[PDB]
Amino acid sequence: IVNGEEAVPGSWPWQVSLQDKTGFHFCGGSLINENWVVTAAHCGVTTSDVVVAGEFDQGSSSEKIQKLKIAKVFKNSKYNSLTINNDITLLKLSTAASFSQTVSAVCLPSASDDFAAGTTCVTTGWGLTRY
Amino acid sequence: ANTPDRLQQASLPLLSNTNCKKYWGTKIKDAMICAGASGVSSCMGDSGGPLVCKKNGAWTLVGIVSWGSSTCSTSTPGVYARVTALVNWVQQTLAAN
């Protein structure tokens, strides 16, 4: 996020970090359950990747995180890799997440609710702060 | 490097697909929702993360970081996977597994 701000540690408890097997962060995700994570289909997550929950600082030589294995990847079959439409993937955890002060789930909307233009929302992540 | 070690956050407005089309045109599909162009931008590494809105006192997942400005221009709206459009699929998948 370009022109964002540092978040209060653990204030976005559903925020997860997806790491490949080299140990590097390649994408963000969200805990919707103790057993599931929702991310983008374009992220190309495999069962080789690990879900890191309860993290704030990636430079930590130790912090209280949960490295969780992925049991199965549920890609949306309508994902178009040319259009990038229907960009969603669900991840079923091998090992459930232990919910706590810093690890908890986000709410899901119904297909019928309306989030009107102009609504003030928030986005989070470990993406670049400058291009 | 321009990579933050600490989690970042940003407040931003949702846009109407119409207004979004002003910028991206034809690229905006039904299962997409735009946000920003208000002085903030999602950038490389934000992909897959949330777009949340408060509803009845609780935070709800409205979007998933999908794509946006080439240069992460803060005057260009970011594009997000519209969860309203995809949540039926989520619920049916959870109900079966």
């Binding site: 986000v106 709410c107 899901l108 | 407040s11 935070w59």
Partner: peptide
């Protein structure tokens, strides 16, 4: 769901 133990500050 959606109610953090540590409330978001902004």
């Amino acid at each position: 769901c959606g109610v953090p133990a540590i409330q978001p500050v902004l």
